[model samples]
Target: GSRVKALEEKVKALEEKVKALGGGGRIEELKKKWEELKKKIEELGGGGEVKKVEEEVKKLEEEIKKL
Candidate 1:
């Protein structure tokens, strides 16, 4: 459950990041992708390696914040 919670937190953080950027077209697309990822994770019952996803999300967050 901690894994799922962590992913949710990441998504929430990403949402805030996107919001801070004023919701541009690219950000919207990114948001959509994140939503899809969340769905997939939910379907998988939070099993498997999500560390990569977390790192990817963190990198995206850094890039978006740099914009």
Candidate 2:
């Protein structure tokens, strides 16, 4: 049926969009950047910024796990 075909097409389009989102590679890059930032801030005798960065990292970890 035309309706069924349309549904299938929409589903495929969504899947393609998901694939184009960079998935694991994007997450890995973000992880590396966050790690580097954390270290740099620590070296500078981080104050509240360290805690904030740590929280952000934790949130990112949770998001990665969810994904």
Candidate 3:
């Protein structure tokens, strides 16, 4: 109960901060970071590594949802 309450409060604060940060800015930053990695992957061009990184970045929206 205590842990969840703390988490909920932290989430509320982060959510407010995120709102001030702007959704487009957040999404664009994620896209830019992912694109940077994609550039590197284009050089390597193999192994499920890119997919793994992609899946990791995909959680951006979910993390925001938590906030």
Candidate 4:
């Protein structure tokens, strides 16, 4: 219940954001963020970035598949 509640809260925030940009925009945002991070990592190297945090960013993007 707690997890769903938390997910719902997150989804609600995402939905509000999408609504502001027109419905379904959150998916586009998610996709764009994923691609940009992917490109950055590709350019920087496997674990590259200012803090070498590409892996974390990749993980978060994949985990946000519901978007």
Error of 2 at 63 (Å): 0.9
Off by over 4 Å in 2: 1-29, 32-36, 39-41, 44-46
Give Cα-based local distance difference scores for all models.
Answer: 0.67, 0.47, 0.46, 0.44
Which 10-residue span in candidate 2 carries the lowest summed lDDT?
A: 1-10
* TM-score of candidate 4 to 2 decimals: 0.36
Full ranking by TM-score: 1, 2, 4, 3
lDDT at 18 for candidate 3?
48
Candidate 3 residue-wise lDDT, 7-59, digit = tens: 34433444455455556646555445445544543443445454544443445
Colliding pairs, model 1: none
Ranking by lDDT: 1, 2, 3, 4
Report the lDDT tens digits of candidate 1 across residue range 1-67. 4565777777777777777776656676667666666665565454666665676566557767765
TM-score of 1: 0.61
Best by lDDT: 1
Q: Which ten residues in a row have the lowest lDDT in candidate 1?
A: 37-46
**Best model number under TM-score:** 1
**Can you write out model 4's per-residue Cα lDDT over 1-67, one digit (the tens) per residue?**
2333333444454445534454364556564654554445445533324233344353444545444
